[PDB]
Design a protein around this nucleic acid. Sequence first.
RNA 1: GACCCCAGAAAAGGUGUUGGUUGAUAUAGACAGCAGGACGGUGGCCAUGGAAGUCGGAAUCCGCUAAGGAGUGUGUAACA
Lengths: 134, 161, 190, 196, 52, 204
Amino acid sequence: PNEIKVVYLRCTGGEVGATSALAPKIGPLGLSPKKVGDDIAKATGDWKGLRITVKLTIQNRQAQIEVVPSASALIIKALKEITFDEIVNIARQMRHRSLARELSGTIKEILGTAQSVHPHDIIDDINSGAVECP
Amino acid sequence: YQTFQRIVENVNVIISTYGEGESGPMGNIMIDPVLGTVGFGSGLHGWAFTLKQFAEMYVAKFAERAKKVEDMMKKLWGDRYFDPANGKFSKSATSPEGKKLPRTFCQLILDPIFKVFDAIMNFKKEETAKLIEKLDIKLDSEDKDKEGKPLLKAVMRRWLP
Amino acid sequence: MKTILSNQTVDIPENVDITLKGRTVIVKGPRGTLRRDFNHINVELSLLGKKKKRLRVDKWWGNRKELATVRTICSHVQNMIKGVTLGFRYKMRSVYAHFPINVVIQENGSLVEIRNFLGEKYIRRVRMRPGVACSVSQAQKDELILEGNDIELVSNSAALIQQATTVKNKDIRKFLDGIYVSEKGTVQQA
Amino acid sequence: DRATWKSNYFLKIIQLLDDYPKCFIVGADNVGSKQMQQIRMSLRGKAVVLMGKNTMMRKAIRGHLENNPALEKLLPHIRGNVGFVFTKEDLTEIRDMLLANKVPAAARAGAIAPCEVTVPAQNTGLGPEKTSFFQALGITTKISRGTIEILSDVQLIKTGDKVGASEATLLNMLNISPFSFGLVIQQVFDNGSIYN
Amino acid sequence: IIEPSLRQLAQKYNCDKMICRKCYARLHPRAVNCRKKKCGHTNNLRPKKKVK
Amino acid sequence: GRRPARCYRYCKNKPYPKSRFCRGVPDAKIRIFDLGRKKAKVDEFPLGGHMVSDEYEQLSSEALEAARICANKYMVKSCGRDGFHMRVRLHPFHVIRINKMQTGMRGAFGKPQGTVARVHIGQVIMSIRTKLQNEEHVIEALRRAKFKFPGRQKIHISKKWGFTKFNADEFEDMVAKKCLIPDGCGVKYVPSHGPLDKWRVLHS
RNA sequence: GACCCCAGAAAAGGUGUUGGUUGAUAUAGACAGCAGGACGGUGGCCAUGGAAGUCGGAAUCCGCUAAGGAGUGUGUAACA
Ligand SMILES: [Mg+2]
Ligand SMILES: [Mg+2]
Ligand SMILES: [Mg+2]
Ligand SMILES: [Zn+2]
């Protein structure tokens, strides 16, 4: 099984946390990280959307790497400190980018609506960069 | 048998979870009827048995004796079946003909006890005499005249102390 | 409002024959015969087919309540046909938490003895309706089979057993012991 | 909104039928929206799929008969849960890719089981706290290496029966491939033809 | 220790029912009106409470 | 401490207003008669619903207050705080007396106990104006408020536009023709007579 | 139930039945039943000890669609 099956998601983020995290509660599932492992993993995952950071960890039997799924609310709140079309246009390139799509227009509409937490008249009369991403 | 298996499984999962120690300072802690660490019986009527005792009496029917008793102790518990017609153990539930087979536990541990219980509870004097003479146990005074549940309790005390 | 005419027709299989004596229906099939009169309902019954054996129930100038009886009669006659061709079989599972319910079947299946219901020393004796036979199944452990031709009698006997095993002075949502009808099917599975 | 929805659907179906002269009529099993979208991803680059009310389709094609004849063959064939896949590729390629992209759906409770699945005797590797689900099914199990180990093969589900609620969740946590099914091509239509 | 299948079978007859809020009558689970004259066949019903 | 309202249900006496002859009257229970968005313009709430009595009877100020509170609560729950305007159109101007028990019926004229509103058959008790899509909520709120009143009442969806006296189908083109000028929650009717300077202020 | 005064009844209810008013759906397939699907962004934001569609405060969008509420209710500590 690729020498390890640790594809479980960890939903801590922002501050280091360490002791305050639920990582001690969920660590004995894989038994590898413990308090050194969650510290090095959170040190390597402190940035990249300093919000709640629902992320995934992959363990190399001592050292853990972290891949952050591209949650739209996560990245939008990360890049917020307005049209801002270009930043979200370029934010969706490295994504899995499924979105049940037909074109990349579908992805940009979906996130232009998920950012409604108004960017809806933009969704209505959107005409710029329809096939700009691909 | 199913109730016994559920009980031993629950005890073993408690041991596995809260006893995080694997085979270390204590070794293997899990109870196994094959290993002789599980006993059965009733304290109120003062009778109990173990797979050790039943393997012992069946070997006596059939050091080195200790080793053979240990082997049949593994044979008596589990899903391993016994053919009543042939008289030989087996692994598959389907007989060579295809009929279902009782497991070794239910066929040669529970069955004699069940026969004793049925005979004494139903007051079949000929069958109780046959069972006691086959199980070659003796009875003292004041209980051979007792019949029914006292007879059963006395017989079980005498047979499986 | 009085509807001018309300009629319904039922089809009779080849192996079963139906005879009319006024409003008395006699349904005879391979499994036996069944009598049922409907003199309490003012309808006309007619046999139409010598080839496909249709039975028609007509009600003339009926109001709401007595138009509700046409399909009642038709369904009763269909149950009669079903009983004389395939029969009726009600399965009953006895459920219990602690005390096993010991059911023994007396003479010819017409008497049922429930012994250990909830650990009571009282013996329940339930007599089946005539023409209904009770038995203890071999395929399932705690299962009774009630078989007969009249659905009325078979299900009434099943209700007799089910209401005989009734918990008193206890929370019945917790004490769930009793014998309950599990399946209402036929015999001969055709 | 119902009237405009149905009119938009009629326009869609007639234009799609005109634009694609070659299509396969395919019956949909108990296929979820996830499986449908997976097929949409795997096929949308080269072909399309449309499915809706049989009466919608039959009315549309019956009205379109006189404009574009030879479509009357499809009318007494679109019955049941069926739809069309409109493709411009070859029959063998579409058929074998559509049978290739099958999805192992889970075993849902209260469902007919067409395929017979038996769990082997192996260390399932899950923690020693899900023994309740094994005891519910009556499976004798022991603990080895701190994990549940199946001592012997047990036949879980037969063919043509009901999948119990406990069996469904045991299969789900045991993470294997239960009975699986996709969309099966009822038949084809190649410019006025009926084949298998 | 009733098995879940038989437990559901017993609950079909003992628990899965409606109760008239006016006369407490035990009605079939799909009931919309009480069958009893003394409450006026009211539509004021509630589920029978579970032991959960 | 208060008598049952069945003792003062009927208009048996002549109207007995609080005046210089009837002094020492306790204040009525209802002091608020308009709730919701009272400041809403006339064009915002074109739908009007009325509770209309079928009885010639007396409604106590306590009952008016209770019905007002109930209707307000339901309207806030269903249409929001700013989605409706309610007007209670009955004011408790009649004073009901009590002869609390020298001895007996000697000097039996009573002291002011409370106030009631005297309502006629076909008279409006309460009105709710709101958007077109809240007709069901208005009907249900008025239906619930009906349970606080003794007699029989009907719920009527008015043909007028809002709280005005002009029909809802002619309101808009009268506003277009400047026969109506909005002023707060109502409209002002502008007849074609008067000085021409007022007409010149319009059309400009 | 059954005749002025008159010698007993109310609000409120009824899927009992009978008339009536108004509206809506339906051969482009209603209604009811039995049978399948009920997705992806997304465990949406803020609230937090846990609130993942379902204790709450606002928002109420988008794509794939035949269709699916960023949710009608049961349920979980939260999930399921
Ligand atoms: Mg029927
Ligand atoms: Mg008690
Ligand atoms: Mg007076
Ligand atoms: Zn009732």
